[PDB]
Amino acid sequence: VGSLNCIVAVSQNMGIGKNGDLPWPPLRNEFRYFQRMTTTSSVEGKQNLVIMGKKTWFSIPEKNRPLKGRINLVLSRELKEPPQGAHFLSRSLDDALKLTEQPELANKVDMVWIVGGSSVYKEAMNHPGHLKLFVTRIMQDFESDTFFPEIDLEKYKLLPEYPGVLSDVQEEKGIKYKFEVYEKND
Numbered sequence: 177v178g179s180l181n182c183i184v185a186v187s188q189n190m191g192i193g194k195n196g197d198l199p200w201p202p203l204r205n206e207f208r209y210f211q212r213m214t215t216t217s218s219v220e221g222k223q224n225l226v227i228m229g230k231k232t233w234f235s236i237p238e239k240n241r242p243l244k245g246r247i248n249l250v251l252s253r254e255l256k257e258p259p260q261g262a263h264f265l266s267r268s269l270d271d272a273l274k275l276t277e278q279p280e281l282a283n284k285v286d287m288v289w290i291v292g293g294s295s296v297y298k299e300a301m302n303h304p305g306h307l308k309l310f311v312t313r314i315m316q317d318f319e320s321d322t323f324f325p326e327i328d329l330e331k332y333k334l335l336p337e338y339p340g341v342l343s344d345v346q347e348e349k350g351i352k353y354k355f356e357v358y359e360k361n362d
C-alpha cells in the first residue's frame with residue numbers, strides 16, 4: 177500500500193455539507209478533479225482505495241456508486257455488511273487501514289484516499305504519520321451543517337506546487353475556488 181491522503185472541498189466558513197448534500201451548487205470541474213485525483217494510480221496493476229463514512233456514501237448519487245475504478249470502503253458500526261454497491265465495510269479507521277495490509281488487499285491497493293466526512297477526517301488528521309490533505313478552497317461562505325476539522329498549520333505545510341494540480345483561481349457558476357495540497361509527517 178502507498179500513501180494516505182484526505183481530499184475535501186470546503187467553503188470559507190469551513191463548511192463541507194448541508195442536509196446530506198454539498199453547501200454550494202454543483203461545480204462540474206471540481207467533481208472532475210475529485211474523480212481524477214482519487215482514481216489516478218502511478219503503480220501499474222493497482223487501484224486506489226477510497227474510505228468514507230456511511231453518510232458520505234449515501235450522499236453520492238446512486239448512479240455514481242461505487243466510485244468507479246476505485247476500491248470502495250465504508251465505515252460504520254451499525255451496518256452488518258457493506259451497502260449495495262460498496263466493496264468493503266470496516267468498524268473503525270484503524271480497522272480499515274489494517275485490512276489494507278491483509279493478503280486480500282496488500283498487493284491490490286496503491287493510494288488510500290479518505291473522502292469524508294468530518295469525524296473520519298478529524299481522526300486521520302490527528303493520528304501520527306505521513307499524510308497529505310488535498311483541499312479545494314471554495315472562496316465564499318455557504319450555509320452548512322457539517323464542517324471540516326481545523327488544519328494545524330504548524331504540522332501541515334501548504335506545498336508551493338504539486339504536479340497535476342492547477343495553481344490559479346478557478347471559477348464555475350460564479351463561484352471562485354482554488355486547489356491546495358498540505359503535507360505533514362509526524
Ligand SMILES: NC(=O)C1=CN([C@@H]2O[C@H](COP(=O)(O)OP(=O)(O)OC[C@H]3O[C@@H](n4cnc5c(N)ncnc54)[C@H](OP(=O)(O)O)[C@@H]3O)[C@@H](O)[C@H]2O)C=CC1
Nearest residue numbers: 184185193196197229230231232251252253254292293294
Ligand atoms: N465537501 C466535501 O468534500 C465533502 C462533503 N461531504 C458532505 O458532508 C456530509 C456527510 O458527512 P458527515 O455527517 O460528516 O458523515 P460521515 O460520512 O462521516 O458519516 C458518519 C457515519 O459514518 C459512520 N462512521 C463515521 N466515522 C466512522 C468511523 N471512524 N468508524 C466507524 N463508523 C464511522 C457512523 O455511522 P454508524 O452510526 O453506522 O456507525 C457515522 O454516523 C454530507 O453533507 C456530504 O454531502 C462528505 C464528504 C466530503
Ligand SMILES: Cc1c(Sc2ccc(OC(F)(F)F)cc2)sc2nc(N)nc(N)c12
Nearest residue numbers: 183184185207210211236237240291292312
Ligand atoms: C466527497 C466529495 C464530493 S460528493 C461526490 C458526488 C458525486 C460523485 O460522483 C460524480 F460522478 F463525480 F458526480 C463523486 C463525489 S465532491 C468532493 N470534492 C472534493 N474535493 N473532495 C471530496 N471528498 C468530495
